[PDB]
Design goal:
part of a larger assembly, 4 chains, A: 410 residues, alpha/beta, five-stranded parallel β-sheet, 19% strand, B: 305 residues, five-stranded mixed β-sheet, two-stranded parallel ribbon, 13 helices, 9 strands, binds adenosine-5'-triphosphate, immune system, Bacterial Defense system, Toxin-antitoxin system
């Protein structure tokens, strides 16, 4: 895919210059207070998302972004005849230029409806294919933001939360694209439905395909069939049909009471093994995500529950005493870990994970294991993290980048 | 930088309930992580490095061992933390013959020392060096080069130890790394003789003192036992010296077929990164544990944690 | 409903009932009639439930057929009847996730044709195909009956459901004879009245 | 001064119990998340402020609070036949019992001048001497909280801010009495961590000559200013309760910050729940572990 490789800033807020080259896998940024790491995160988010109309809220001279595939974007802020202009020029020679005051008028029209400048920017980023990869922006105040959303948000509809965040922290703040835990729960329910429908299709396929194995057609197989039947009956995924042990006992009794029979037995064992592997294949990402999550939880486990009568599966926390609780009973740090592990999951969309201070309300044991669990999922995303905690950045010291702002005298 | 101080790390020890291990460098952390993950791939042991702990004192800033001793002294008696350092030339006798006064892993209240000079001295088993050089080779004349190297490796350890002792006598540990080049080495009948080259970028006084120390220390090393001799070679010195010795033997035994190809292979091997060599030796060392009785590892440290 | 579409369900209709009581006095009852969005959601849920019931029936019939085959193990008209059943299974919209019945039938027929005990396997295969086809009719009985009632009124379009293996979401909406798909909101007012008044008298609706 | 010495937690949502004995001045708290560190901070900042009506919103069975002077406050929640009650019993014999439904009715009366039960709570804290010392509560999300009234609060008037915080994070959230933008000692205490300028004796002293006001600073600088202003005796006579002081803080500025707070010699109790080990460098004696004991239910 396309990943960012180099960022060259000139005169950000007319005070500091920065030039940071990035990795395609992990970018751990560390520095002092007021270095501009949050400003760099906002600049990167507005660059990657294609929301160049935010750059009228930034004081700069020239911003150069070089990706891994050779795409170079030059954003230049000019001031001609007291009117401020933003000119964004690409590596292929394509460019657009728009007024800062027109951008502010468009923002005020949105605040007090799609205007002409927003549609022109959308057409410009559509005809140049500038919005191939998104960027997940994780603010440091996201726990309060998700608490605000759940006490009154989706990726496609987050206008009120984005407006609230831009009112609170300035209009340069990009759109809130990090997923909410409610969105995580809804996505989990949707993925459970997708896995169930794939299991249904494979069940129909296996019902049709088993007869061609029968028409084509000893003590160790009976034990293996018994173990597979006990494993399938004691499985969450077979809560709609878990009657394999009675079938095994009847098969063993019918063999014992009185060639091609062994062929039928081995193709049935192969069919049951293929069914079990397809069930594991369909639930591999969700089981891996729950194994990553439950490695941190002590007295509970996030698990999915079926019901034979209730066709709506239950997603939530299971206790060792047998209690079931929703995801809203989790604390702040557990919710943060859930969102960060879903961010590094393959279930999430292809974006650039931009996190500022990931260690918010996290125990020091969880900070040492968060990046291990994030990189074990092998999602292939480009992760940029700005942290002040060394327990976050342990074991990945080769990707630690220090920010040294170059102050300019005026 | 973004790292804990001595006091911050001690407070972290108070807060954390994990089983922890403190080592000197990051390379020791990576090697011990591979060693632990071989026996238990799901192990939850966290290995810390004293290199990544900031020190306010300028002298203590780059002294990892002093950081470990300070931390160990202030939490002396804890059960959940272990410390590992490098023995260096401590507990070694130089009374005309190399003598090891410990001959086992040191242990003093969760503080351990490597059996050899450093952790890399565990890589100096001949099978590990063979496997690693065979795996990381130009793959042109590997088998004959390995056979010659396997012949040279028995007596070459005396030369390597003499080089390390000559380096520590004048306190110029890093001097043989840039002074001696693979072309100066000559492959004899199992031995080597680093001729004193007339032309060197460094001043002749340092070169002369280095070769005088090497000549004055080599017969003492020869009379010593081979097994004791293989542990006193400096880890950083030893890695580069083995890389050059193998580049030299490869070019020596591969030049007759094609001089240009042998020279290209020798220069390619000599230009290989130190990290590649150390990682390959570490992986080979991990793989040889349990297959050969002559491969050692900090068993006491693994047992303790 | 035009006022509602510019700013609802059979259970959450507080705003519309409040507005209607504002216009027509406070004696007016709550507006409980189902919106076509509620009908579409209920249709999707019933289709999903029917698919899950079909999967459970597939598993049960597979286990029972294997047991009966293996226990009973130790003609020309049957192959044609099984061919017709597999053709009818392949030519249904409900089998959009699996349409490989004819290939399996051809493989079984090619294995048979090159060379008693096989007659029992043939008749239980025919019975398994008949049982699966009957469970497909039973599980989709109310949806197909309701859509047959609705499509008897619509002239140039028909309401139908769609499955596709690449996605995992059963598509519910209008189907045109030229192959285009449109949602149920592109209906006129009278056709929407037909849709709601026929869902309210259907079995899928609540007891009322 | 009156400082809390012991909080007894029993059947806290009928799942975990805690019992923590507190130091007089400094109480550093470490523990896992979900154990109840912020819950303990909210419990203390509701009891010490005297907001007993918050416990009708909190699921528990019995909580006993004993201060440093020996005065005991036992707060117990029961279920008297679908109408639950909040029984706050003191060691002086005067106890108040009111229905939880009565408390929700009082809250609904305020939502749609105090009501009868709010005046009953004020009467009980008035006639029994339960609020000698206040509690200047610092939320862990205080940067966004002072940002909330930035684009639209004072140390005494925070009823809109505390009501909004109770909307976002549950009605148990106490009154937000932390300051928002001895005295010269506080100036030099700020001046240790200042970088581009210095603050001494209403205006800043830049080397370029700018007499900039209080509110032009960055987020971490304003966090330091708010955490250090109550550290002085210039703040109110309150048990300074700070939730995670390392929020938006460098790992290196946390060391001498508690030295600067304890340089004021204020004598008020300071309780902090922190995960950063650079907060309590040299403050390990005041470090308190939170170990909630799970109970079967
Ligand atoms: N108009 C402006 N908008 C934002 N920041 C500005 C502006 N003018 C100057 N700055 C400075 O730019 C920096 C941006 O702060 P930022 O949040 O990026 O800091 P940081 O490096 O992430 O660390 P910290 O939050 O610990 O200070 C601050 O030093 C701030 O004073
Ligand atoms: N009414 C309630 N019923 C049950 N559980 C609750 C209730 N209110 C909160 N909880 C849960 O009880 C726990 C309270 O612990 P709390 O979050 O205060 O601990 P903490 O150590 O301060 O953690 P953090 O840093 O995440 O705030 C959390 O897991 C929270 O989700």
């Amino acid at each position: 895919i396309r990943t960012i490789s180099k960022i060259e800033l000139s005169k950000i807020h007319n005070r500091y210059n920065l030039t940071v080259d990035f990795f395609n896998d992990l970018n751990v940024i560390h520095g002092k207070n007021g270095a501009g790491k949050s400003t760099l995160i906002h600049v990167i988010a507005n660059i990657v998302n294609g929301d160049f109309i935010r750059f009228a809220f930034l004081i700069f001279e020239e911003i150069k972004a070089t990706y891994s595939d050779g795409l170079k974007i030059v954003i230049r802020r000019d001031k001609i005849d007291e009117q401020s202009f933003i000119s964004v020029t690409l590596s292929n020679g394509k460019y657009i230029k728009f007024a800062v005051g027109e951008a502010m008028a468009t923002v005020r029209e949105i605040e007090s409806v799609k205007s002409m400048l927003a549609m022109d920017i959308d057409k410009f980023v559509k005809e140049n294919e500038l919005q191939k990869v998104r960027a997940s922006y994780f603010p440091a105040f996201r726990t309060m933001l998700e608490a605000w959303s759940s006490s009154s948000r989706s990726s496609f509809y987050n206008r009120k939360a984005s407006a609230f965040a831009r009112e609170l922290f300035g209009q340069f703040l990009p759109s809130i694209n990090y997923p909410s835990p409610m969105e995580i729960e809804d996505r989990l329910r949707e993925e459970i439905r997708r896995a169930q429908l794939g299991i249904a299709a494979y069940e129909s396929r296996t019902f049709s395909e088993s007869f061609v194995k029968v028409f084509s057609a000893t003590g160790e197989l009976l034990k293996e069939i018994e173990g597979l039947a006990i494993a399938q009956d004691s499985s969450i995924k077979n809560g709609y049909y878990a009657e394999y042990s009675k079938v095994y006992e009847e098969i063993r009794s019918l063999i014992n009471r009185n060639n091609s029979v062994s062929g039928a037995l081995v193709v049935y064992r192969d069919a049951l093994r293929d069914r079990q592997d397809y069930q594991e294949k369909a639930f591999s990402e969700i089981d891996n995500y729950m194994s990553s999550v439950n490695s941190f939880l002590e007295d509970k486990e996030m698990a999915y529950d079926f019901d034979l009568r209730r066709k709506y599966p239950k997603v939530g926390l299971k206790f060792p005493d047998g209690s079931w609780s929703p995801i809203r009973v989790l604390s702040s740090g557990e919710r943060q870990l859930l969102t960060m592990l879903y961010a590094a999951s393959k279930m999430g969309d292809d974006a650039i994970v931009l996190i500022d201070q990931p260690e918010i309300s996290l125990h020091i044991d969880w900070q040492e294991d968060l990046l291990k669990r994030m990189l074990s999922q092998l999602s292939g995303r480009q992760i940029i993290v700005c942290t002040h905690s060394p327990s976050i950045a342990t074991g990945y010291e080769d990707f630690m980048i220090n920010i040294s702002p170059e102050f300019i005298s005026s | 930088s973004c790292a804990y101080t001595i006091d911050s790390y001690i407070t972290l020890l108070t807060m954390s309930s994990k089983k922890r291990l403190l080592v000197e460098g990051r390379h020791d952390r990576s090697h011990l992580y591979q060693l632990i993950y071989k026996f238990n791939p799901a192990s939850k042991v966290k290995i810390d490095t004293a290199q990544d702990i900031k020190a306010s004192d300028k002298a203590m800033s780059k002294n990892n061992r002093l950081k470990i001793e300070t931390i160990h002294s202030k939490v002396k008696g804890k059960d959940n933390i272990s410390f590992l350092c490098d023995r260096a030339f401590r507990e070694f006798a130089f009374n005309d013959q190399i003598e090891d006064l410990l001959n086992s892993h040191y242990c003093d209240d969760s503080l351990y020392w490597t059996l050899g000079h450093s952790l890399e001295n565990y890589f100096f088993n001949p099978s590990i060096i063979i496997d690693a050089f065979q795996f990381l080779s130009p793959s042109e004349y590997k088998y004959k080069a390995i056979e010659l190297f396997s012949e040279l490796i028995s007596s070459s350890f005396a030369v390597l130890a003499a080089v390390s002792l000559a380096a520590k006598d004048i306190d110029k540990a890093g001097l043989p790394a840039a002074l001696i080049d693979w072309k100066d080495i000559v492959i004899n009948d199992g031995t080597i003789k680093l001729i004193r080259r007339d032309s060197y970028d460094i001043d002749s006084a340092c070169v002369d003192s280095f070769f005088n120390a090497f000549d004055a220390v080599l017969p003492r090393v020869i009379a010593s036992d081979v097994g004791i001799c293989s542990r006193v070679v400096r880890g950083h010195t030893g890695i580069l010296l083995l890389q050059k010795l193998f580049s030299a033997c490869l070019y020596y035994v591969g030049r007759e077929d094609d001089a240009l190809q042998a020279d290209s292979s020798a220069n390619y091997f000599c230009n290989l990164s130190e990290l590649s060599l150390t990682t390959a030796l570490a992986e080979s060392w991990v793989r040889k544990i349990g297959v050969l009785e002559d491969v050692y590892f900090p068993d006491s440290l693994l047992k303790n944690i | 409903e035009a006022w509602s579409s510019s700013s609802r369900s059979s259970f959450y209709n507080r705003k519309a009932s409040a507005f209607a009581r504002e216009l027509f006095g406070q004696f007016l009852p709550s507006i409980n009639y189902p919106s076509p969005m509620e009908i579409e959601d209920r249709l999707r849920e019933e289709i999903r439930r029917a698919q899950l019931g079909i999967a459970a029936y597939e598993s049960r019939t597979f286990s029972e057929s294997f047991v009966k085959v293996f226990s009973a193990l130790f003609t020309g008209e049957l192959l044609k009847e099984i061919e017709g059943l597999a053709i009818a299974q392949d030519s249904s919209i409900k089998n959009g996730y699996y349409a490989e019945y004819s290939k399996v039938y051809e493989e079984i027929r090619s294995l048979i044709n090159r060379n008693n005990s096989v007659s029992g396997a043939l008749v239980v295969y025919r019975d398994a195909l008949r049982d699966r086809q009957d469970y497909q009719e039973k599980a989709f009985s109310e949806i197909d009956n309701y859509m047959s009632s609705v499509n008897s009124f619509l002239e140039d379009k028909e309401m139908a459901y769609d499955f596709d293996l690449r996605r995992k979401y059963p598509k519910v909406g209008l189907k045109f004879p030229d192959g285009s798909w449109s949602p149920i909101r592109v209906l006129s007012s009278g056709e929407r009245q037909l849709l709601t008044m026929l869902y309210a008298a259907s079995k899928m609706g609540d007891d009322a």
